[PDB]
Amino acid sequence: MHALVQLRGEVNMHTDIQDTLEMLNIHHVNHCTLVPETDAYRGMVAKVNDFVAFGEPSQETLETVLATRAEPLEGDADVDDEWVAEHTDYDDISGLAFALLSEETTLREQGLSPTLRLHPPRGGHDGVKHPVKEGGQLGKHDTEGIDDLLEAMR
Amino acid sequence: PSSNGPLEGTRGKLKNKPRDRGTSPPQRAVEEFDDGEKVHLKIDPSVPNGRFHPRFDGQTGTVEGKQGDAYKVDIVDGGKEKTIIVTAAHLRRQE
Amino acid sequence: KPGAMYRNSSKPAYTRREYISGIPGKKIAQFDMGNNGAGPTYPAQVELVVEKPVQIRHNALEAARVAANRYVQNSGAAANYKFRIRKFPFHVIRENKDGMRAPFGKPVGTAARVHGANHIFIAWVNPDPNVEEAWRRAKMKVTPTINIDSSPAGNA
Amino acid sequence: FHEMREPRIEKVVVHMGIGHANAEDILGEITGQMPVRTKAKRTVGEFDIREGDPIGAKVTLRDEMAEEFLQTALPLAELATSQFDDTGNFSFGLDVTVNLVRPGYRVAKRDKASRSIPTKHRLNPADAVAFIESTYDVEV
Amino acid sequence: ATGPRYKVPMRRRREARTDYHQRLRLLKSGKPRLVARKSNKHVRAQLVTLGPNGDDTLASAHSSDLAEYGWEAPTGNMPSAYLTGLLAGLRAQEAGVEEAVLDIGLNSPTPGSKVFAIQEGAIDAGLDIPHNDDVLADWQRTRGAHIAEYDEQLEEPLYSGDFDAADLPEHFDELRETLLDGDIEL
RNA sequence: UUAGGCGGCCACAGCGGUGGGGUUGCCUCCCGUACCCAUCCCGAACACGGAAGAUAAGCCCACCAGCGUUCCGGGGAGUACUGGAGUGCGCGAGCCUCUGGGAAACCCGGUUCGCCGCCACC
RNA sequence: AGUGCAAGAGCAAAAGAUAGCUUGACAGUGUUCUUCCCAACGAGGAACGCUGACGCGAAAGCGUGGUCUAGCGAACCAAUU
RNA sequence: CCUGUCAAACUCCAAACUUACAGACGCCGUUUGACGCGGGGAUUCCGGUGCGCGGGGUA
Ligand SMILES: [Cl-]
Ligand SMILES: [Cl-]
Ligand SMILES: [Mg+2]
Ligand SMILES: [Mg+2]
Ligand SMILES: [Mg+2]
Ligand SMILES: [Mg+2]
Ligand SMILES: [Mg+2]
Ligand SMILES: [Mg+2]
Ligand SMILES: [Mg+2]
Ligand SMILES: [Mg+2]
Ligand SMILES: [Mg+2]
Ligand code: NA
Ligand code: NA
Ligand code: NA
Ligand code: NA
Ligand code: NA
Ligand code: NA
C-alpha cells in the first residue's frame, strides 16, 4: 500500500494523466490517497509518476495523517479514535491504519472519503522539477522519505 | 494519400511473409461460426475472395447470421456500427 | 557553396538511384592508398575518429584524403604503409537553385553520413607515425572536431 | 539385390529437327508407329516467328519397338564415351536418343505419391556403357 | 531448404498424396466424403467427416475383409470395388450417415473405373451421393463379366490356383446378395 | 501403425547422408493388354487384369547436423531505439538524468533429421 | 516465367500453358461495404445473397467478364426496347 | 576466399507504441437517468504557439 500525493497542478498536464489522478480520487494539488499495490494500480501510479509523490508510509505516520486529515464520506466530523470505533470495524485509528497498510480494507469501505486533503509542506518540499534520486520531490520515495513529506503536510 | 482506392497503403497488410506464401490450408476456409461468436478480422493475402475493406483488418466483431456461405459480422468503426460480409477464410475465433 | 548548407543529418536518407538521376560523379580518387598489395600486417594502426554525426560532401572527403596521403609522402611514393577511407558518399544532396514554389531542389552533389565516434580514416604503419601528422591535416578539412586514435600500438 | 538394379531401355526417341513435314513418312517406316508434330517456342529470325507451328516430328518407342529399332540404329553409329549422359543416356545420329534407367522408375513417373529417384539408384554413365556394350557392339 | 525465404509445400503436397484445391471444393458441400482409394491388390472405401485436429472416419470397408463374408476371389478388381463400396456404404448407414460426396483423391474420373464402382456400391447401400449414372460401368463389368470372358480366351488359367478356372461373376451375386441382409458388422 | 487410408499444424517437418526391413499376411516396384479407359506418337502415364520374381527405388523403422529452419543458455546488451518527466548540459547539431519498456547482427554451447488426430490392421 | 497496361499486391497437381467445349460479358431483385475513416452526401465501384435461365464437369463445384486496386458522368431534350 | 560501405519509394529480422474485443480493478450512472434515441437553436469552416514526430527549404 502506497501513499499518493499530487504535487503538480493540472495546467498543461496530459489529459490521460489527469484523468488517472481523478480515477485515484485526487482532484487537487496536495490531495493524498492510499493505493493498494496491485498490477492495475501499479500501472496507474507509474503513469502519474511525474506529477506526484508516493511510497509506503510507516504505521505511525499514516496514523498521524489519518487523525489529522481523514474525513467522513460527508461532513466535517473529525475522524478520531472514538469516530473510528463508533463508525468502523476497527476500535481506533491504529486499528484502521494497520488494516489499510495490510490492504485488508479501504477508506471508502469504512465510510471515509478516499482523499486525505493535506496541508502545504511546512518548510517546503524538495522541488517539483526533479525526482527523488536528483534531490527533487517527485516519484517513488523511501518509507522515511514519504513520512517526512506526509508529516510536513500533516 | 496520392490516390483513394481501397488498396491504398495496403502493401504491408495485404502481403505474405515469403514462407506463408502460396495457397492457404482449406481447414480454416471451411470453419463454421455461430451467431454471437467473437471473431478476429484479418485478410488472408493468399485468399482472393470473401474479403472485406482493408480498413477493418484488426477488428474483432460478432457473427450475426450469414449470407450464402459468407458470414455477416457486426463491428463498430470508431463510433459507427457496421456490418461486414466476410468468409471464414478471413476469420479466426477469439480466445 | 558552404558546408553550412549540407553538414547536418536532418533530412531523410536520399540514396535510391532508381528514383534519382543526374547525380554528379564523386571527386574521391581512391579509397585504398599505399601498399594495397599487402594486407594489414603492420605493428601500428591509427584511425581518424569523427566526434559528431555529420554529412561530409565528397568535396571534403577528397580534400581531406589528398591532404593526408599527399603528405604521407614523407615516407615516399611507394613507402611502407596502407591508408583507408572507409566511408562512401551515398546521400544525394539537392539545392533549390520560382521562389519557394516547386522548391524540391535538383541534385548538386553527394555526401557521406558519419556518426560521432566512427573512424573515417584508418592507416597502418610500422613505428613511424608521420601518419599522426597526416591526420592533423586531414581533420582540418572536414566539418567536425576529430580524435586521432591509435589502436595496435603499445610502443609509446 | 540385382535383377532390380540391372539397367533396361525405356523409350528411344527418334526425331528430325527440321525448320518448317514430309519427313514424318520416313520416321513412320524407320520406327513402325506414327510420328508427332513438333511445335516451336519463341519468334526468331530464321523466318521462324510462328509460335504454334510444325517444325519437325519425333517418335517415342518403348519395349520391343525400341529394341527392334536399335538392332539397326546402333550398328549405324560408332561413337561412345563423352557423348554419354550423366544419367546414363546417349544420343547419336536425324536424331536417335536412348533413355536408360533401372526397374523402379515408375515411382517418379506415376501420379500418386510420386518421388524423385535417389542419386544412388540413378544410372551412371559407366554402368550404362556396360549394359549396352554388353549387347552387340563396343564402347568408345 | 535453400534459405529463410524458401517456401516448403504442405506436407501432404510434398508426399504427393492430397490435392488441396480439390479438397477445398470437396469440403464445400458440408457433407461427409466417400473416400475411394485403391492399391495394386486391394480397394478401400471410407466415409470421412471434418474434425478439430483432422478428419474423422465414421465408417469404412477394405477389400480384404471382404472374404470375411465369403469372398474367395482376388480383391483388386471391379466386383471387389463395388462390394467394398456397398459394405462400407452399409456400415455407414449403421453409423447414422445418410449422404456423402465422392472423393477420388488423385485418381482419374475415367468412366467405368473402380472408384465409380465403389461409388455405385455405396449408393446402393442406401447412401445419398451426387452422381452421374452413365459414367458408371454397365453392371455386367461390375459383376466381373469382362474377366470371365477374358478367361474364355483361356489355354491357361487366368487365376494361379486361386478359385475356379473360368471364374465366377456368380460368386459376385452370392456376395452382394449376402450383404443385403443381417450378418455381423453391418 | 512388421510397412496402410484420410488428415490437422504447414521446414521443429526442408536439403543431403548412413544402417535395417518383408518365410503366409501390407505398401510397392513388378508381370501383362481381352475388356472400361488411354496416349495431338508411345499400356510411359492414365485405365483395367493379375502374382513369376524382388526388398534394389519408393515406403516404414533406427540414426547422422554439414546446409536451411525452430526454440533455449551465456555473451553481445539493459547496448540501439523508445512512451512519460526535467529552470540538467550544449553556440548549436545534439546530449544527459529520473521513470516505464526494450531490439537486431554476430560469436560460443545446447535443441531440431517432425508433432498430433481419426479409421483400419498379428 | 507468365498473368493486356502504372505501381504495389495474389497465384504452381494454379489464378500460369496447351487442348477441347462453351458465351455467366445472361435476365431480375436485393444485402453490405465503399465513394464520404471517424461522421451527413449523388453517380459510380466492389463483396456477398436470393429468383429465373444457361455453360461446363463424374461430382462437390466453378462462371454476377479479364486475379486485386484506374478505364468514368446528374437533371432537361432526343433516339431506341 | 579476403576486404570497404548504404537505402523515403529494400527486408532474413524487429521494438517502444498505437489499435479491435473481452475480463478484472478503478471511476461513473440508476431521485444528479449515465449509455443511447428523436427533435429546436446555433456559432464555426482566416487561427496561432510550445513540445514530440515529421516533409520541403541555405535559412
Ligand atoms: Cl467491408
Ligand atoms: Cl488411390
Ligand atoms: Mg466532504
Ligand atoms: Mg516560510
Ligand atoms: Mg523549490
Ligand atoms: Mg509502411
Ligand atoms: Mg533396402
Ligand atoms: Mg474476379
Ligand atoms: Mg441542358
Ligand atoms: Mg438512341
Ligand atoms: Mg501510428
Ligand atoms: Na498462404
Ligand atoms: Na512560377
Ligand atoms: Na575540424
Ligand atoms: Na497439331
Ligand atoms: Na525397398
Ligand atoms: Na452507391
Side-chain angles (χ1 to χ4, degrees), chain D residues 1-139:
Chain D
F1 69 101
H2 77 298
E3 185 186 60
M4 300 303 265
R5 275 269 307 185
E6 57 182 63
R8 79 177 185 196
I9 288 176
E10 183 206 57
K11 86 177 176 177
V12 183
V13 184
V14 306
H15 132 291
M16 295 192 271
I18 315 176
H20 35 67
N22 60 304
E24 285 178 56
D25 309 301
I26 58 182
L27 271 180
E29 305 172 300
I30 187 183
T31 59
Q33 66 185 199
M34 288 183 59
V36 142
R37 302 292 174 167
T38 293
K39 299 177 185 172
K41 290 186 178 183
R42 297 184 185 184
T43 284
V44 180
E46 41 180 290
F47 207 171
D48 185 40
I49 60 178
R50 184 168 167 170
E51 175 148 306
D53 51 2
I55 306 184
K58 75 179 181 184
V59 185
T60 59
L61 299 170
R62 291 178 148 76
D63 282 296
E64 303 180 300
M65 299 288 265
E67 298 182 299
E68 298 187 302
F69 173 83
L70 284 175
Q71 299 185 67
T72 40
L74 301 178
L76 305 185
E78 329 166 303
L79 289 173
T81 34
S82 87
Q83 174 189 49
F84 271 73
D85 228 68
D86 311 57
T87 321
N89 301 159
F90 72 107
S91 183
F92 62 94
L94 176 153
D95 306 299
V96 174
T97 342
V98 185
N99 197 188
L100 306 172
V101 73
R102 27 197 59 148
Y105 198 61
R106 168 185 172 61
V107 170
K109 293 302 175 186
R110 48 174 177 176
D111 279 353
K112 324 173 196 171
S114 64
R115 208 118 330 183
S116 195
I117 299 309
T119 61
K120 317 76 173 185
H121 199 66
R122 287 282 180 65
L123 187 57
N124 294 64
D127 305 299
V129 181
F131 172 69
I132 304 179
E133 184 176 53
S134 167
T135 309
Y136 299 58
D137 65 62
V138 176
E139 61 174 293

Side-chain angles (χ1 to χ4, degrees), chain E residues 83-146:
Chain E
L83 298 170
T84 305
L86 174 63
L87 177 52
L90 303 169
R91 288 165 174 171
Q93 281 285 277
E94 273 303 306
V97 176
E98 304 204 76
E99 61 190 9
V101 188
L102 179 60
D103 186 321
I104 72 175
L106 301 170
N107 288 119
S108 301
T110 302
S113 295
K114 294 184 285 182
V115 292
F116 283 143
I118 298 185
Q119 170 179 55
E120 212 184 319
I123 302 177
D124 286 325
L127 233 42
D128 234 291
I129 308 172
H131 62 284
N132 188 300
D133 288 314
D134 54 63
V135 80
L136 317 174
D138 77 293
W139 198 218
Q140 285 307 300
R141 184 185 174 74
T142 302
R143 283 170 44 75
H146 64 300

Side-chain angles (χ1 to χ4, degrees), chain A residues 40-79:
Chain A
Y41 272 110
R42 193 166 113 257
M44 300 195 263
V45 313
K47 181 182 197 59
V48 153
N49 176 290
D50 308 292
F51 309 84
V52 91
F54 69 94
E56 171 174 47
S58 68
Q59 179 77 49
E60 317 200 340
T61 300
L62 180 53
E63 269 178 41
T64 306
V65 166
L66 275 182
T68 187
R69 303 291 169 178
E71 292 178 309
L73 236 42
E74 283 176 45
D76 266 310
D78 296 3
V79 182

Side-chain angles (χ1 to χ4, degrees), chain A residues 8 14 50 129-131 133-134:
Chain A
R8 291 181 78 188
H14 287 297
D50 308 292
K129 292 189 177 307
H130 302 285
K133 288 189 176 179
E134 266 178 37

Side-chain angles (χ1 to χ4, degrees), chain B residues 5-65:
Chain B
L7 308 193
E8 171 280 309
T10 65
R11 189 230 255 288
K13 60 166 60 173
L14 297 186
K15 182 182 58 173
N16 270 158
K17 246 70 176 180
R19 277 186 56 176
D20 306 292
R21 191 240 303 179
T23 304
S24 305
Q27 186 83 322
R28 64 190 183 219
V30 192
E31 187 69 289
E32 295 281 305
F33 300 90
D34 306 305
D35 307 355
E37 289 197 66
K38 290 288 185 169
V39 295
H40 290 126
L41 278 67
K42 178 66 198 79
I43 295 177
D44 189 321
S46 310
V47 185
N49 319 296
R51 295 188 172 196
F52 51 72
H53 196 293
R55 270 183 189 143
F56 308 128
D57 244 25
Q59 283 293 323
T60 301
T62 301
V63 174
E64 296 286 46

Side-chain angles (χ1 to χ4, degrees), chain A residues 121-124:
Chain A
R122 339 222 188 323

